[model samples]
Target chain A: GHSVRVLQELNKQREKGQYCDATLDVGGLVFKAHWSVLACCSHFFQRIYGGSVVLPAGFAEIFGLLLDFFYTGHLALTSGNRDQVLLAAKELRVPEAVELCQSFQP
Target chain B: SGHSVRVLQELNKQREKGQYCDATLDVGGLVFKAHWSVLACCSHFFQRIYGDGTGGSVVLPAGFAEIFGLLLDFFYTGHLALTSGNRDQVLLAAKELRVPEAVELCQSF
Candidate 1:
């Protein structure tokens, strides 16, 4: 219950725009993430360091959605996006989006 | 899913701590002796089965006790131990046991 509550609190903060300890800039769109969530993030930049980080230009849509995927496990996809989403899940590497967590730890 | 080395190591250490092991889980034919408290705290399935307070051994699904043992280790330590060699077995065991966390954790690795 306590851990679930903590996860809930993270999501709740995502909603009220509270307790966001990290910010992600994708293209011109801004996304928010949690400090704790990023800790498990095998993404070399985030896990090894903290502070705002930006993805390469273009495809902000996928990377931006990944931030949400971390705080919330939902990611919408269609035939046009399924292939890319799967690839994105591979590259983005957050726990929830992670169909496995250890192998893709970077 | 990507628990840090530190976290994973600490949890695995708990499993092998043997500090307070109190239950003998005999699955299929293989024997798994572990701390009851670890399983009881991690999964309600274990909690209810051990709920009888008898502290007796548990018999699991036939032909899948090894997987169950791996899953138990994961539950207690977050040490998935899932690989191509054993992925199928762990997946089947997780599904049978309805261990969503294990399945979720293993699917990526």
Candidate 2:
């Protein structure tokens, strides 16, 4: 299960570092950066499930995306899921995601 | 002037309805049987109005009472005047007055 795997990995990674990084190219934009993965993951789980899901106590992949934005100004959210992503971003306190979401119009 | 007078007349009609028997309380009990009327009036005047699913109960500031009362008075007597700053005060008065419709109107803003 995603939940069980996330918990086990989080417990293993906690003693390392607070920040995490990830890289991907979007439309020829080579982006890279680092952020507080634990906080970002905690925020993501909280908003999606209304604080019911007990997330592992470490950084997760979702936080990596947030850090990427902070470091490189590249947002992961696209036109397809902008509103839902924006809602989660706002709740998670991801500034780059929020900015990207705000720019979108329907 | 045209918008103001029209709003005034609507308020007066509401007040009269409140006075008569068989008046039912609105969703949040802001006024008696005039929830829609108040919402229509305020929506005409401003943008960004929303209603909670519970009732017509609007979550507006406590200063629209004056505007509401002025509108009611105008409807009754056909004469009224108001300032921008006084609008919020009037809204507050509506809450104090316990008119469910007025509360709903405020919340929409």
Candidate 3:
């Protein structure tokens, strides 16, 4: 938990857009984050970065949650959005999110 | 995932709890019951087998039991870290299992 706390603390500082390494626009929601954070936590961000990659609709909302997961180490999965989050996490190959959603599932 | 310690701790807990298991991994004659959700979330090997509820016991390649022993710990705690000595075998087992997490762990190791 120390590493996660350390990483998240550093990540929160990056959210201020200071000394950030990369920026991504998910359906118009611009996000500035450290390359290591996204790449470390996700396979999708590792492959598609600094390029205008095509993503499905409603990616902004879901991607915001994913990014939050990276920074906070948890995704908010409710009954209404659990399925959507699970599918999105699967597509992104976010093992952590996938595991969380699985635990949240019935 | 980045939280390998927490993940593995929960894994060890669930394994020791001896409940909520939906799948069993039979590697090299050693049977280990596992939570399919955990394995499926991390490895495609478990997903494919557990998705349709196919064969309960999966027969793996030779020496995979020894290889999987290391991998099982890696799956839980990810220690011994990954070095050139076991890098090739780790890569082989992880890649074959479709466990991108382990594969990436080996990559950086």
Candidate 4:
């Protein structure tokens, strides 16, 4: 997580054209590029789940919340936002995310 | 937090029963050994934190407090009850505690 955060911060710096020693920007870009690995994995999972299963209405929101935690290591599930997170996760067809939320029975 | 007295009583009962006695609760495929002191510590911590709100002026509900208590218990003893409310609080507390496992659990949610 620390490594991911550092890489993210470095990428942010580079996007603004900031000059830092030790090729931090290049390294960060390369690291950030690897995020596609998860995306690819997600796609594979989606295929396995198949498009036939229509996720619950709240799946997308849940999926987005999961993505947010992946990026920013925080989960604030308010009553108002819980369904949103659920929706996101279901829409994204992330089995683990769906299972975690379902474990809560929300 | 509301169950502080009850928690204390349970703890006392466990102490009287002996520290390393064999008692169990089974949930699904998981078998759990009972530890009263650990439960007491969690409830005590919950009571403390329940009285002290987030270091600011935000009052959480009793449900929230219960969830917080459960999360603290999990952190202290590696045991948790993952209800929706408890899960939410656990995730938030994990962020506060900077625990990778908690954070990952939250992300998985």
DockQ of all predictions against the true structure, Cα-based: 0.02, 0.01, 0.03, 0.01
Candidate 4 lDDT for residue A79:
62
Interface Cα root-mean-square deviation for all models? 11.1, 28.1, 12.4, 19.8
lDDT for model 4? 0.40
lDDT of 1 by residue, B1-109 (tens): 4223333333345446532245567676777766443454355566577665554677765688667768877765556788889998888778776677778766887
Every model: Cα RMSD to truth: 14.4, 20.1, 14.8, 20.0
TM-score of chain B of each: 0.69, 0.31, 0.75, 0.35
| lDDT on C-alpha atoms for all candidate structures | 0.57, 0.40, 0.65, 0.40
Error of 3 at B58 (Å): 52
Candidate 3, TM-score of its B chain: 0.75
Please give each candidate's TM-score: 0.41, 0.23, 0.45, 0.26
Look at candidate 3 and tell me the lDDT of residue A101: 90
- Judged by DockQ cut-offs, the docking class of candidate 4 is incorrect
Off by over 4 Å in 2: A1-64, B1-109
Instruction: Give the per-residue lDDT of model 2 (tens digit) for B1-109.
Output: 3323332343345446652112233323344333232322223321123222333334444344326546444323433343456556646655554544444544555
Q: Is the docking of candidate 1 incorrect, acceptable, medium or high quality?
A: incorrect
Worst ten in a row by lDDT for model 3 chain A: A1-10
- DockQ, candidate no. 4: 0.01
How many angstroms is residue A5 displaced in model 4 relative to the true structure, after the best TM-score fit?
4.2
